[PDB]
Design an enzyme around this catalytic site. Structure first.
Site, PDB file in Angstrom:
ATOM      1  N   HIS A   1      55.218 -16.856 -14.721  1.00  0.00           N
ATOM      2  CA  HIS A   1      54.733 -17.762 -13.682  1.00  0.00           C
ATOM      3  C   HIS A   1      55.537 -17.459 -12.418  1.00  0.00           C
ATOM      4  O   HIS A   1      56.307 -16.489 -12.360  1.00  0.00           O
ATOM      5  CB  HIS A   1      54.741 -19.246 -14.121  1.00  0.00           C
ATOM      6  CG  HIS A   1      56.091 -19.916 -14.198  1.00  0.00           C
ATOM      7  ND1 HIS A   1      56.874 -19.901 -15.331  1.00  0.00           N
ATOM      8  CD2 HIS A   1      56.737 -20.713 -13.311  1.00  0.00           C
ATOM      9  CE1 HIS A   1      57.963 -20.627 -15.123  1.00  0.00           C
ATOM     10  NE2 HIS A   1      57.906 -21.122 -13.905  1.00  0.00           N
TER      11      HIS A   1
ATOM     12  N   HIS B   1      57.784 -19.072 -10.409  1.00  0.00           N
ATOM     13  CA  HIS B   1      59.098 -19.565 -10.005  1.00  0.00           C
ATOM     14  C   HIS B   1      60.157 -18.459 -10.036  1.00  0.00           C
ATOM     15  O   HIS B   1      59.997 -17.404 -10.674  1.00  0.00           O
ATOM     16  CB  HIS B   1      59.535 -20.730 -10.914  1.00  0.00           C
ATOM     17  CG  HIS B   1      58.779 -22.002 -10.677  1.00  0.00           C
ATOM     18  ND1 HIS B   1      58.653 -22.982 -11.644  1.00  0.00           N
ATOM     19  CD2 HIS B   1      58.108 -22.454  -9.587  1.00  0.00           C
ATOM     20  CE1 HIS B   1      57.960 -23.994 -11.146  1.00  0.00           C
ATOM     21  NE2 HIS B   1      57.601 -23.691  -9.911  1.00  0.00           N
TER      22      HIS B   1
ATOM     23  N   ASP C   1      62.909 -18.120 -11.595  1.00  0.00           N
ATOM     24  CA  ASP C   1      63.463 -17.642 -12.861  1.00  0.00           C
ATOM     25  C   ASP C   1      62.514 -16.685 -13.559  1.00  0.00           C
ATOM     26  O   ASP C   1      62.863 -16.137 -14.607  1.00  0.00           O
ATOM     27  CB  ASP C   1      63.863 -18.815 -13.794  1.00  0.00           C
ATOM     28  CG  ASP C   1      62.729 -19.777 -14.131  1.00  0.00           C
ATOM     29  OD1 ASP C   1      61.673 -19.742 -13.476  1.00  0.00           O
ATOM     30  OD2 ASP C   1      62.901 -20.587 -15.084  1.00  0.00           O
TER      31      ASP C   1
ATOM     32  N   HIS D   1      53.823 -26.467 -17.574  1.00  0.00           N
ATOM     33  CA  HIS D   1      54.949 -26.440 -16.649  1.00  0.00           C
ATOM     34  C   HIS D   1      54.482 -26.069 -15.248  1.00  0.00           C
ATOM     35  O   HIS D   1      54.937 -26.655 -14.249  1.00  0.00           O
ATOM     36  CB  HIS D   1      55.995 -25.458 -17.184  1.00  0.00           C
ATOM     37  CG  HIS D   1      57.072 -25.117 -16.214  1.00  0.00           C
ATOM     38  ND1 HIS D   1      58.177 -25.915 -16.023  1.00  0.00           N
ATOM     39  CD2 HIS D   1      57.215 -24.065 -15.374  1.00  0.00           C
ATOM     40  CE1 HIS D   1      58.962 -25.364 -15.116  1.00  0.00           C
ATOM     41  NE2 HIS D   1      58.409 -24.229 -14.722  1.00  0.00           N
TER      42      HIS D   1
ATOM     43  N   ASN E   1      62.184 -30.772 -12.983  1.00  0.00           N
ATOM     44  CA  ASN E   1      61.436 -29.623 -12.426  1.00  0.00           C
ATOM     45  C   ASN E   1      59.988 -29.623 -12.920  1.00  0.00           C
ATOM     46  O   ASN E   1      59.419 -28.568 -13.230  1.00  0.00           O
ATOM     47  CB  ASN E   1      62.096 -28.260 -12.724  1.00  0.00           C
ATOM     48  CG  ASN E   1      61.458 -27.084 -11.907  1.00  0.00           C
ATOM     49  OD1 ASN E   1      60.793 -27.311 -10.893  1.00  0.00           O
ATOM     50  ND2 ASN E   1      61.670 -25.836 -12.356  1.00  0.00           N
TER      51      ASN E   1
END
Ligand SMILES: C=CCCc1sc(N)nc1C(=O)O
Ligand SMILES: [Zn+2]
Ligand SMILES: [Zn+2]
Length: 231
Positions: free
Chosen positions: A83, A85, A87, A148, A179
């Site tokens: 995804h 983000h 990280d 998420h 988050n």
């Protein structure tokens, strides 16, 4: 034993053999005043390695490549970000400079661009609708639906029954949600059950952050997600 957040200084990366030809990579990074661990995957791809997700930033991702070369010694030739983000795509520019071909879904590429994050070069086709799955070398990429994030992918290694859930799956010890800014709380439990439905034989389940488990991580995450929408 699996390495934990307090054992990995920021800037270092650990590798952890999950099964023949399958490793997780573990790094640490600051987020909103605290340091958190973060997992990704490494899968033997014949004579090459397929990388799942950066190690959360440019410095960590450079250490990842060095540790890979030291401990495995095969070239990392492709990477997939699960995804948009940091990280998952933070460090894509390092991978690109190192010679790695970087990949994500068109949704992920677009959401990274809107966010100002690094953008993988190549688009992964065939993953736009909940329940889509595509084969990508030694793994299957699967879009379970929004969770998420709206774009989050999971990854399955058939030869080993390893399921990498990314940030859509929490570790057992985790009992709260933080988050969830980009999350779809209403869709998330149903996306988790799409994963359970498609991968009921999974022997190892790796959350995006924290210690690996089995399929019990799926229901545990639902409970934590549902707990958030009931308060
Ligand atoms: C790790 C747990 C704290 C919140 C953060 S920070 C980050 N890079 N990801 C998450 C997540 O929930 O997936
Ligand atoms: Zn995320
Ligand atoms: Zn995350």
């Amino acid at each position: 034993e699996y390495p934990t957040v307090s054992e990995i200084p920021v800037g270092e990366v650990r590798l952890y053999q999950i099964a023949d030809g399958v490793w997780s990579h573990i790094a640490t990074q600051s987020f909103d005043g605290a340091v958190y661990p973060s997992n990704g995957l490494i899968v033997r791809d014949g004579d090459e390695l397929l990388l799942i997700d950066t190690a959360w930033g440019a410095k960590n991702t450079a250490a990842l490549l060095a540790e890979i070369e030291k401990q495995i010694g095969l070239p990392v030739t492709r990477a997939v970000s699960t995804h948009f983000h940091d990280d998952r795509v933070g460090g894509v520019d390092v991978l690109r400079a190192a010679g790695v071909a970087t990949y994500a879904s068109p949704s992920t590429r677009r959401l990274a661009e809107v966010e100002g994050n690094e953008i993988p070069t190549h688009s992964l086709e065939g993953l736009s609708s909940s329940g889509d799955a595509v084969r990508f070398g030694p793994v299957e990429l699967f879009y379970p639906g929004a969770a998420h994030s709206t774009d989050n992918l999971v990854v399955y290694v058939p030869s080993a029954s390893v399921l990498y859930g990314g940030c859509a799956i929490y570790e057992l010890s985790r009992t709260s949600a933080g988050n969830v800014a980009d999350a779809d709380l209403a869709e998330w439990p149903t996306s988790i059950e799409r994963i359970q439905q498609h991968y009921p034989e999974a022997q190892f389940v790796i959350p995006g952050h924290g210690l690996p488990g089995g399929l019990d991580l799926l229901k545990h995450t639902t409970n934590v997600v549902k707990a958030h929408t009931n308060r």
